[PDB]
């Protein structure tokens, strides 16, 4: 049901069985399907269309000529009803587009809170955007690929399917990312290569200089010492043993699947 | 006129003497121009403007925020009454821009049947695509670009105007390709290279063991031999007596006029 | 007001305040916000989103699914009232978005006359594009950047934030520009690097012979002779005492912040 303490336009379409949260306001020709679930406070500004069985939380700000829920661009996607599931406090610009899951794939394509999705962003089908990433102008996402927290992807930067891009990473723009990207590294190019440790990143959110130290150290282990990656990872297990912050890398050694990127 | 059994949404605005066929749907605030043809079964979904001298097909799903027969970009184009075609059972997903031709180009854009044109996939004047073919994310043709049947264009991937992508090619994302691409090849890279043969692409088509050799043979005259490709091309055609799949290089090579892309 | 010779489509939504001038066009499902100004003969063609503090010119071209004044996407901006300045006989394709400034920034996104702005370019918060530019698809600056008289930026290309890209510059498309780009130049890559004058843009606008040879001749001076640029400097303001084109240099000089492109 519509709160009674929400706003929808005259001209906007909000289906029967649509659920609007208090004081959520639906815009001008604003299109919302019958599946829609839209938390207290979003605005979907105008021209906006959600559809879909699409969960969308507290405070986001959906901008003119977004797509969010949408059936994916899987070649064997059939119709099947998967999901979309974004959070709180997210902006998503002009022409973002986030698309549902496939069976395949899992049935969920999932964005979490405190996002920025810039102008033409794309999150398809079964990908997980986590908290507090920025996606630049045309960043795209192809299917299944993780953006974990707070990772900031340049504008005009694709993923490849399946990857993995590691919390606290920046890619820079202009980029094309083929393999997984472990946490706290910067990438860039085409294909992107590594280029050492966010440090600026991780001193802006709290990181001490410890953290740091064992972080680049983790690097140089990875990426410096020549030794292979599995000869590396009980050696990162026994630094996180005194530095938590390294179990990241441990984390997501354990999800990573097409490798890591290399220069 | 619009077909008893087609469905236009009160909010849309289908101006008089567009062709409406059956059992078509015009979404809401979709905008059909008065020389719009909509073949029976066609969906728009919302949003979509379609103007121009445009002839559209059947079974057609176009979505929101689609500009499709819009004046072109061309420097010199001055709204001269140009055409768009687009054949049967296209997928036309958020944000595509297929542009009205040139007199000069030809007059005509053109648009085969059973593509998948993805999200800001961009056609310009004077461009020719084929059949099954697909062009990802932010894929964006030039004025006067062929793209022949089942090639394949990554996502963020740029073809110089006046180029030619052959038939069963595949380009990969992030590319930019400057020259023509024979039919069968693999290409990737800025400027975009030869890769070989897309294998398995013929291989899922249906391309016999036989074909497949003869087509890498004649990938191996091109691009192995040293020798100039007037050289070789009585050499492919001699090849293509036995191996008629090997023909699709020589009506290739009659269409060529920006040379092939190379290493 | 609105002008009794302007044309409000009875679907377009105009804010009172909002000043529409005569013979004006607000197409279908337009929104124009209360602190608009739209000049003599505009045209929104429909699904236009114009807000903020914006002044849009004479005889301007929007085409459907622009969003002009946005507010910009500044991780700082916090909803000043910042202004949007765009000039006369500019044509805004599909899907271009023009933000509003920053208050750190100037508070002023400003765009000249006679531009081409293709599908989906977009102009950041702060940036200065002047007259007769043309950004092709996808082109994309980033915050703070300058465009000079003249210049072309090809499609899929980025500008680094605070970047100025000189007059009548010419960046290959699928580029991306990290330092600023002296005037007269051709640049391409991404890196992008300097390929020499832009001698046919010369050719085309009337630069006379002994014109295109004083620029070349400070591009060596530049590029080629080995010098620093604090040693090319006063023999390009010599050379500029002679042929005045090369003062355009000069000015550049004054702005620059970012170094110049190199090879
Ligand atoms: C070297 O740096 C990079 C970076 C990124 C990529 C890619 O993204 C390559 N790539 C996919 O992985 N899926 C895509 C697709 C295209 C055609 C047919 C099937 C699947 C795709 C992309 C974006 C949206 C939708 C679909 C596609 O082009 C490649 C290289
Ligand atoms: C090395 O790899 C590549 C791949 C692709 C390209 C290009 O596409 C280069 N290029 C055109 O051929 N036409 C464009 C244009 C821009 C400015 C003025 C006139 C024409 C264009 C592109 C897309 C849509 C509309 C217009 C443009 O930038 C270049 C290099
Ligand atoms: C080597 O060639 C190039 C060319 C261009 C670039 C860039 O544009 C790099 N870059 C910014 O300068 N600002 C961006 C941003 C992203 C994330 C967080 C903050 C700011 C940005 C871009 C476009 C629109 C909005 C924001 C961003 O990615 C880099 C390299």
Same mark, same amino acid.
């Given at each position: ?45 105008? +021209? %906006?269309? $959600?559809?879909?069985?699409?969960? @969308? !939380? ?5 901008? #003119? =000529?977004?797509? *969010? /829920? ?73 299917? +299944? %690929?993780? $953006?974990?927290?707070?990772?900031? @992807? !340049? ?5 490849? #399917? =399946?990857?993995? *891009? /590691? ?97």
């Amino acid at each position: 049901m519509i709160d009674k303490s929400a706003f929808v336009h005259p001209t906007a379409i909000v289906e029967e069985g649509a659920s609007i949260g208090a004081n959520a306001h639906i815009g001008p020709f604003c299109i919302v399907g019958p599946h829609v679930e839209i938390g207290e406070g979003t605005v979907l500004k105008s +021209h %906006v269309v $959600v559809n879909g069985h699409t969960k @969308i !939380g507290r405070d986001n700000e959906i901008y #003119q =000529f977004a797509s *969010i /829920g949408e059936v994916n661009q899987d070649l064997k996607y059939a119709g099947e009803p998967t999901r979309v599931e974004i959070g709180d406090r997210n902006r998503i610009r002009e022409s973002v587009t986030i698309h549902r899951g496939t069976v395949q794939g899992g049935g969920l394509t999932k964005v979490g809170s405190d996002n920025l999705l810039m102008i033409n962003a794309h999150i398809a089908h079964d990908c997980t955007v986590g908290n507090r990433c920025i996606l630049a102008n045309n960043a795209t996402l192809a299917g +299944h %690929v993780s $953006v974990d927290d707070f990772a900031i @992807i !340049g504008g005009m930067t694709a993923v490849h #399917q =399946f990857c993995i *891009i /590691g919390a606290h990473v920046m890619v820079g723009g202009c980029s094309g990312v083929a393999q997984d990207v472990p946490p706290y590294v910067i990438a860039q190019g085409n294909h992107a290569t590594p280029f050492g440790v966010n440090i600026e990143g991780l001193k802006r959110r709290g990181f001490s200089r410890e953290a740091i130290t064992a972080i680049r150290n983790a690097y140089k282990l990875i990426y410096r010492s020549g030794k292979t990656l599995d000869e590396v990872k009980p050696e990162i297990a026994e630094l996180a043993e005194t530095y938590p912050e390294v179990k990241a890398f441990t984390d997501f050694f354990a999800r990573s699947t097409r490798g890591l990127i290399r220069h």
